[PDB]
Amino acid sequence: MNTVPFTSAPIEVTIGIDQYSFNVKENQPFHGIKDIPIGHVHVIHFQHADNSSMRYGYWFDCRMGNFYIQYDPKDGLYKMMEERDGAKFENIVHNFKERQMMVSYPKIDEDDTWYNLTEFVQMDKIRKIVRKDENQFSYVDSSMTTVQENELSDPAHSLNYTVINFKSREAIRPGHEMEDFLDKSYYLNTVMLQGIFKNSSNYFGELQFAFLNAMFFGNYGSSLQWHAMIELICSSATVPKHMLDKLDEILYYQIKTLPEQYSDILLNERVWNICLYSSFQKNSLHNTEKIMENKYPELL
Amino acid sequence: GAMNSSNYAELFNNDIKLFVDDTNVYRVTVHKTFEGNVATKAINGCIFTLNPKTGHLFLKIIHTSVWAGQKRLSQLAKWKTAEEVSALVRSLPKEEQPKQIIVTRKAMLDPLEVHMLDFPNIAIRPTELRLPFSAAMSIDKLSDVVMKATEPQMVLFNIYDDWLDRISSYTAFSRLTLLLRALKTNEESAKMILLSDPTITIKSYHLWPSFTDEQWITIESQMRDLILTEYGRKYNV
Ligand SMILES: ClCCn1ccnc1
Ligand SMILES: ClCCn1ccnc1
């Protein structure tokens, strides 16, 4: 079990760690989060009490280094930093553990939620979507735009998701216009899976990462990407059976975790009604259809 | 974006544009079978592609053989229309290619956009005008060439005859839409109006009769009366 030490908490802030969250008061004696499960990526995220503008946060994997959070009063945000001195980091973590100044990652033993949401998410793939090579962790916030959004403006601060566009020469083979537009199997299997992602695990990893950035930061472009990656599969007549079964599991846990009161802004009615009721895969997503109909029957 | 009454003079500017109407591409007669079921029999159709400034009409005849063994014909017809319009653009010299294609039915937007991806600078637009181009098959010389075709064929027409020698393209388009609207509303009476007087003939090289300027005014008034008469008959007014 790993630990992220806070130098201090000088401003009142709601802190998220994965799907959990807690409030810290201004100058409260808070020094970090312990007992973080090894084996998964994690996200530590922030919303300031005096300015809910800019949710922001950091994706990290404790296997890649020792990281900590330090409030920067000039840039006005909790910043993630790597500690290169392992003996110092162990020493700081131990004293704070002894003084009980840390919250414990509150994982219930029965509870596979975080694994189910991050099954295919790898830190190395995050670091290619979020380009800041000098750090082993990745910053994301509510306002960052995607490469695709910028094409339709600072490129260094962009989310480089894979561009999906159904009315593009990449998606449509000359001579197969009707075929490829009505059945996206070519675009899914040849262009995206074989060509760009190499395998379905990488495709699902990006899909899961997009959902998590949408949910945790309200990042609009991330929500667009998540829906586009769902629609691309659902609008293909030929999809490997193992991908359909895995997608149903992925989406089920995403819909289960979504806050009920954010459904209006995180779910696209057109995409979901098309995917569940009109698409080639309308009968392939049994678990997702069941939870959607029981939890969000209005949207449908 | 969409084309409506606010930007109507745009149709007659110097930017090359074409209307595409697909309403006569897939045509059928519906009938009973020996067993008392219902079946369709296709008949030859056509794509109506018109330059409203010049009157140039590219009439692509759609022969019934293109439907043989195909499914979902109403859907396929939109994609075949888009394919043929795309082929038409690629065949035209660069300086003749349109800068905009206006489709009369919104269901043609995606098929045509997808077929024209290679032409990102040609705008594909809908229109809020209700244009009566479905009635093109009421023009006897157009109906004749479509029905006689034994294979796919492109037939080239000027739908304004020689009118642009005497009137503007705005006025010619208004005359055309009035004639077609009348033929759509009451075909028999419209043809009666156009042919009643044997001394005014259709030249071998024309689609419509050789009316003088004053006779066109009379004809246009008779067409407006027909449309109004039929409106009163329809709604009991
Ligand atoms: Cl780990 C060295 C930085 N640090 C973290 C908490 N207090 C100091
Ligand atoms: Cl040749 C009659 C005029 N026209 C029609 C289409 N291209 C030319």
Distance between CA atoms of residues B92 and A21, nearest Å: 64
> Domain extents for chain B?
9-163, 164-237
Architecture of the domain defined by B9-163: 2-Layer Sandwich (3.30)
Tell me which of B61, B158, B164, B207 to substitute to probe ligand 2's pocket, judged by most ligand atoms within 8 Å of the beta carbon: B158
Residue of B nearest to A165 (CA): B114
Taking the CA of B96 as reference, the closest ligand is 2
**Of B153, B152, B154, B147, the residue nearest B67 (C-alpha):** B152
CA-CA-CA-CA dihedral for B10, B11, B16, B17, to nearest 10: 120
Neighbour order of strands in the sheet with B100-103: B123-125, B100-103, B17-21, B45-50, B56-62, B153-158
A243-250 contacts, C-beta under 8 A, 24 or more apart: A243/A200, A244/A281, A244/A284, A244/A285, A246/A200, A246/A204, A247/A204, A247/A285, A247/A288, A248/A284, A248/A285, A248/A286, A248/A287, A248/A288, A249/A116, A249/A287, A250/A116, A250/A119, A250/A120, A250/A204, A250/A207, A250/A208
Cβ-contact A173, A191 below 8 angstroms: no
- Do A134 and A64 touch, CB atoms closer than 8 A? no
Task: Please name the residues between 53 and 92 in chain B that touch chain A, using a CB distance below 8 Å.
Answer: 76, 79, 82-83
Q: What's the rounded Cα separation, in Å, for the pair A48 and A54?
A: 8
For domain B164-237, the CATH superfamily is Prp8 RNase H domain, fingers region (1.20.80.40)
CA atoms within 13 A on the CB side of A276: 20
Distance of CA A192 to the CA centre of its chain: 20
Name the DSSP letter for residue A188.
Answer: I
Residue A103: name the closest of A25, A35, A13 by CA: A35
Residue B15 Cα, gap to closest chain A Cα (Å): 26
Can you read off the two tokens belonging to residue B185?
Answer: 């509303």
Would you say A68 and A4 are in contact if contact means Cβ atoms under 8 Å apart?
yes
CA distance B130 to chain A (A): 27
Smallest CA-to-CA distance from B184 within B98, B115, B104, B84 is with B104
Distance CA B178, CA B184 (A): 10
Inter-residue contact A243 to A259 (CB < 8 Å): no
Tokens of A86: 């392992």
Smallest Cα–Cα separation from A219: which of A289, A149, A171, A116? A149
Nearest to A129 by CA among A202, A198, A217: A202
Q: Do B79 and A174 touch (CB under 8 A)?
A: no
Q: Is A71's Cβ below 8 Å from some Cβ in B?
A: no
Helix (H, G, I), strand (E, B) or coil at B115: helix
User: What's the rounded Cα separation, in Å, for the pair B218 and A293?
Assistant: 65
In whole angstroms, what is the distance from residue A132 CA to residue A146 CA? Answer: 15
Note whether B79 contacts A167, CB cutoff 8 Å: no
Contacts of A178 in chain B (CB under 8 A): 76, 79, 111, 114
Neighbouring C-beta atoms of residue A76, cutoff 10 Å: 11
A245 DSSP 8-state letter: H
- Does any ligand 1 atom lie closer than 6 A to the CB of residue A92? yes
Of B82, B113, B118, the CB nearest to A167: B113
Q: How many degrees, rounded to 5, is the angle at CA A252 between CA A240 and CA A192?
A: 35
Q: Which residues of chain A neighbour B76 with C-beta distances below 8 Å?
A: 178
- Residue of A177, A179, A186, A187 to mutate, testing the B interface (most B Cβ within 10 Å of its Cβ): A177
B114 touches chain A (CB under 8 A): yes
CB B57 within 8 A of CB B156: yes
- How far is A180 from chain B, CA to nearest CA, in Å? 10
A40 exposed, middle or buried (CB, 10 Å; 0-12, 13-18, 19+)?
Answer: middle
The resolution, in angstroms to one decimal, equals 1.4
Q: Which residue of A has its CA nearest to B77?
A: A178
